[PDB]
């Protein structure tokens, strides 16, 4: 079944008040009929940044555009062979003397510019883009016929530059200490080099070697004008490519593929009938005259179908995902053969019979909560956490044929109260209602918009939701809640509930251009294999996209799956399943690290979680302090059957407990205690259960659901 099909083409303007986002893309080609992505690896290209330092990271190359230092402005390349590591000194709370953060140095390894741009700053435009690529054009402001096109594509092994009537200039912030033209050694006092291939070496550490390929009709005549600049002798028209040579044995490989470059790619996806699914990238190229060489991430290697690609040994370090390996082939198919079996409930739906009465006692008390106080918060995020925790209780009481939690009267109250708490959100009457944005084609909360639009004028309001941050996190809670309501009572406000919920899903995860109201895959990256949280940053996301909470991302796709189940939508159910599987794969490659992980140095691996994750850096911390229960606890909520039975493996949970959390858990006097101990129930439910009866609960967690989840472990017993 084709998984890349619309959820619907319902017009969201009938449900949310229309706006045009007040913060426009500055460098976007507005006449191409395409939508500027808000949470993409290409998103920095569309906006200015301080000193133009915002990076765009196709990987293994890091790029900056018209960054202000080092000389004539252009397309700056950094290829980080080595990282800069820093450590947080030991505290009583975090005593382990390992590394805390990983960053990539900001330096011009090599820049493509022009002699004509000595005293003018080029105009720039993103002329076209797709999920996997963007074409960036730089041109002389007075003369649009003097320009360079750069097709910037995920995984590209060379930088490609189509020069038009410009004098090519190559500069570095390192010294260029040798130039070999057309595979000839030159004398030490030679300062001009002519030919169509240039192998250049820098004085950096470790030593960078780059190869420049000139593919135009005329050769290049390059003069070394100082330690760091090679300048052509006249205007040039033609394609120039530059590749980092990772090691001497790969020179013939790079030579052989010099004439073929990627220009973009088309993605498709299908489920099968054997609990598997796949997604395929068909790379677009200039020609098929030579092999396409493309760098792949670690999780690509473990899931790719080897039947139509060849693996090389050619490797370069990615910015923050470990080593990449070049693959030969115009087409990749990635497979996930083990889709999650999780639906609404734990795999063992009924808790151990000796706990039924206790659990029922706790469920009744939790349902007796003031739902308005606990679900009608100032913001959608904490409201959603509350809505979902009570949705769990309506769910298990109304599937009593499975859960054996039988109490018809309480089951009705639980669903009635949930409906009543949810109804204001459905009617867009909550404290922070949504707007449909015609510019970026999504929905945004009111709070972060200008005062004239009823907002606070603070773009950080609602955790940046109004500037497209964190939609998967926030809307996941509402989708799960809506799916549960619609599953238990398909009649209740059905038409509006369907339109509203599917709008929230389409905002985050629309899979088809035929949906004309929503940008496609706002929060999912098919190349990275995970979600991105960070949205629009007016002066640049200086470390690129970010993502912190893996579980709140999981929670969105679980909710999408639940909605698919509730509506009999097999493509939606299967797409969400596929993304959950890819999520699980990349989580253990890059984010939650088992002993033996090869994508990080040992002193980062021992931290067990990566912390706050960026395209350009990682930081073992949180935004509200460095207690272990914070840093690790964020990767443990919301605890749902998906997180507990499929995502968080007992091997990881036990290693993490062993090395970090076991020692501090009994000393935690905060709601994080509830978080750690419900996580603990994965491996030691017998000990977790009495702890959960007494410690504080996270605000998205209930004691009754916690006991239920614990007592449904196959190895639970009483203590």
Notes on the protein architecture:
The chain has 719 residues and is of the alpha+beta class. It folds into 4 domains: 1-24 and 78-107 and 259-350 and 422-638 and 640-669, no CATH class; 25-77 and 108-258, Golgi alpha-mannosidase II, domain 4 (Beta-galactosidase, Chain A, domain 5); 351-391 and 393-421, Orthogonal Bundle (Helix Hairpins), CATH 1.10.287.1170; 670-719, Up-down Bundle (Single alpha-helices involved in coiled-coils or other helix-helix interfaces). Helix content is 28%, strand content 23%. It has 18 helices and 32 strands. Strands 2-3-4-7-12-18-17-14 form an 8-stranded antiparallel sheet, with no helix packed on it. It has an 8-stranded antiparallel sheet with strand order 8-9-10-11-19-16-15-13, with no helix packed on it. A 5-stranded antiparallel sheet has the order 5-6-32-31-30, with no helix packed on it. Strand 23 and strand 24 (323-328) form a beta hairpin. Helix 16 (672-680) packs antiparallel against helix 17 (685-692). It is globular, with a radius of gyration of 27 Å. The PDB classes it as hydrolase. Keywords: glucoside hydrolases family 81, endo-beta-1, 3-glucanase, Rhzmucor miehei, supersandwich, beta-1, extracellular, hydrolase.
